[PDB]
Design an enzyme around this catalytic site. Sequence first.
Site, short mmCIF file in Angstrom:
data_model
loop_
_atom_site.label_atom_id
_atom_site.label_comp_id
_atom_site.label_asym_id
_atom_site.label_seq_id
_atom_site.Cartn_x
_atom_site.Cartn_y
_atom_site.Cartn_z
N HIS A 1 7.76 73.91 38.19
CA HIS A 1 6.92 74.25 39.34
C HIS A 1 7.46 73.76 40.67
O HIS A 1 6.98 74.24 41.71
CB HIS A 1 5.51 73.68 39.19
N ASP B 1 7.28 78.01 28.57
CA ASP B 1 6.07 77.28 28.94
C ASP B 1 4.95 78.29 29.18
O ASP B 1 5.19 79.48 29.43
CB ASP B 1 6.35 76.44 30.20
N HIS C 1 2.79 78.23 31.59
CA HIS C 1 2.59 78.38 33.02
C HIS C 1 3.81 79.03 33.65
O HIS C 1 4.92 78.95 33.10
CB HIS C 1 2.36 77.02 33.67
N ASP D 1 3.01 73.89 25.84
CA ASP D 1 1.62 74.24 26.03
C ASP D 1 1.30 75.69 25.68
O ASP D 1 0.14 76.09 25.80
CB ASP D 1 1.18 73.94 27.47
N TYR E 1 0.59 69.43 25.81
CA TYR E 1 -0.42 68.42 26.06
C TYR E 1 -1.25 68.03 24.85
O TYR E 1 -1.92 67.00 24.91
CB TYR E 1 -1.37 68.88 27.17
C1 LIG Z 1 -9.00 70.72 31.79
N1 LIG Z 1 -7.91 71.77 31.67
C2 LIG Z 1 -8.43 72.92 30.84
C3 LIG Z 1 -7.51 72.26 33.05
C4 LIG Z 1 -7.04 71.10 33.96
C5 LIG Z 1 -6.07 71.55 35.01
C6 LIG Z 1 -4.76 71.14 35.15
N2 LIG Z 1 -4.11 71.78 36.25
C7 LIG Z 1 -2.72 71.54 36.69
C8 LIG Z 1 -1.57 71.83 35.73
C9 LIG Z 1 -0.28 71.94 36.24
C10 LIG Z 1 0.83 72.18 35.43
C11 LIG Z 1 0.75 72.32 34.06
C12 LIG Z 1 1.95 72.65 33.16
O1 LIG Z 1 1.94 72.56 31.97
N3 LIG Z 1 3.10 73.24 33.83
O2 LIG Z 1 4.16 73.60 33.05
C13 LIG Z 1 -0.56 72.23 33.51
C14 LIG Z 1 -1.69 71.98 34.33
C15 LIG Z 1 -5.08 72.64 36.85
C16 LIG Z 1 -5.00 73.49 37.96
C17 LIG Z 1 -6.11 74.24 38.34
C18 LIG Z 1 -7.32 74.14 37.61
C19 LIG Z 1 -7.40 73.30 36.52
C20 LIG Z 1 -6.30 72.51 36.09
K LIG Z 2 6.68 80.25 31.55
ZN LIG Z 3 2.93 74.42 31.46
#
Ligand SMILES: CN(C)CCc1cn(Cc2ccc(C(=O)NO)cc2)c2ccccc12
Ligand SMILES: [K+]
Ligand SMILES: [Zn+2]
Length: 631
Positions: free
Chosen positions: A137, A174, A176, A267, A307
Amino acid sequence: AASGSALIFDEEMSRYKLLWTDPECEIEVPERLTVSYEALRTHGLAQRCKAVPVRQATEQEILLAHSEEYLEAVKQTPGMNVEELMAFSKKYNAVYFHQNIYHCAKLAAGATLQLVDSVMKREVRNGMALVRPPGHHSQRSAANGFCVFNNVAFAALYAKKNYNLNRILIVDWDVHHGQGIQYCFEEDPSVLYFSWHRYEHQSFWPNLPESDYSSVGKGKGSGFNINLPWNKVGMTNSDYLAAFFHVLLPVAYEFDPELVIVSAGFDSAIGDPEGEMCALPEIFAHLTHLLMPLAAGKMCVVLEGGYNLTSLGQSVCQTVHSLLGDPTPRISGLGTACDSALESIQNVRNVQSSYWSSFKHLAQIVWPEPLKRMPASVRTVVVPPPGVELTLPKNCQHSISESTAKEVQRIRDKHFHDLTQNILRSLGNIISVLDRMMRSDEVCNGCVVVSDLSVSVQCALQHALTEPAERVLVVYVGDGELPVKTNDGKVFLVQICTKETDKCVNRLTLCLREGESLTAGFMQALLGLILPVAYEFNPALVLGIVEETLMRVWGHMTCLIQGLARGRMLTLLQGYDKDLLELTVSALSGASISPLGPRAPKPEDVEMMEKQRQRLQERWGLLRCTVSESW
Ligand SMILES: CN(C)CCc1cn(Cc2ccc(C(=O)NO)cc2)c2ccccc12
Ligand SMILES: [K+]
Ligand SMILES: [Zn+2]
Ligand SMILES: [K+]
């Protein structure tokens, strides 16, 4: 000549954590790292890896991908107290800072560079870096989504600069979107970026219009960015494998990268509270395995997210298992991708169709623990003609018992009354090799050179069924007709022939026009027809057959087809051919595959293959790459 797998890890990257209340950030914990390394240790995989040490990325290296201003800002965070770190953290989205994270970010980046150097120097064949913080990111002047510096963007920039690479593939699996990576190479055709990601029509973080399938890159980079949005949660093995067969792999083999880097976030695996997908950890053994024929196996896997501490260890182990060459686990229950996945797949294919040959034709929780994956005692058995010694890799071996010999007598005194050349020897070799493959758990696969095709094929197939082998996939190169019954659902036949023609859904017949295009058409059929059917069939054994009557492609198939049946493949080569026998054995033994490099396929072949998909996809849904027309 390269061998071994690198595992780059250091407990120091677990020594920063979130210091204030933030429900978004608290999922990103040191234990993610400690659980993944300990799981590798428990299953004996870390011990089998070359432990390359971490280092710091230098300032000049960080500047490959980030601005001086942003570096200088991050460089002051070690001197900040908690209030100052919280205040600095809020300048960015979903990221927290800590007194030690700048240190750890340089180590996460340097570890990635160590992994690039070991692979590109040929000190290892491939490897994995277990790092925190993640990278994909982070952007030129911003931390984002737990990421400080873009580990995987560094790696491709560093590989370009220091090894003069023209083509690098980044696979971001990933859950995301790695928007930091997209931006980095938006205009760069030398780095192909593929990413799938939970999108839900832009309602899922990071909520970007540019994470959609229509972002194909900009300028000279158009078509070198491939986004596959997931618009519903709960994606399965079948959705992930459909993505690889009908989007990623066709592009990857045409691109022909010189290095593969994987943004390896888990994830996307079942049980993760953030991805909410349903693919099993075992699928990562196959995502890894399906990319290993690229770039002579030069593959650098870099940890991103993941996670669920339990889901996490299991998916890390399956990835390293495949990097080490251990047999892939059988994936059962495969079928069509869901309608949402097919819409996304169809959309991305259509928009990319102006850039890529394979698509060009239609511009006109709780889960069961994974099994154990021990490598076979010796991997590959070889049986050349009588009195032919050959230089064999260290995990291969030549071939005949009394019981075995009694069985060959029974089979002759029933089904071949009048047969007496040295064929009786080949039949005893077939049986003894199969017995070591199926029941003995000693050897994995093998190759036997044979004279008479019918008796050996018939006896190989029939003996395999009673091992028992629930299902047997047969891949035959030759224009004859074989003693293979495809009528009970226990056998599926793939035939690569020259003659023109099939009328049932347990046979796939591929008649490729002879010419210089034969290789591109074969790879098109391999990734988009042969592999999807084979994966759904889920055989217990693969039977390869080559008649003595244009196969620079055979090594890739041997390698990819070992994703089925736990790698238990027996190949019958009719007649001696030193080269083909050596390539078969080499691919069977887990050696790296030489790249194909570059010549587009005949539309006669493309039309022939799409007729095969139309004819087979209602029975074998994993073939679909469009949403089904509803009556
Ligand atoms: C409780 N849960 C269900 C969601 C909590 C939550 C984490 N983030 C940030 C985030 C950033 C990067 C990764 C990753 O894995 N990148 O590879 C994963 C999460 C949010 C953003 C917006 C709204 C909610 C969330
Ligand atoms: K990806
Ligand atoms: Zn991710
Ligand atoms: K790009």
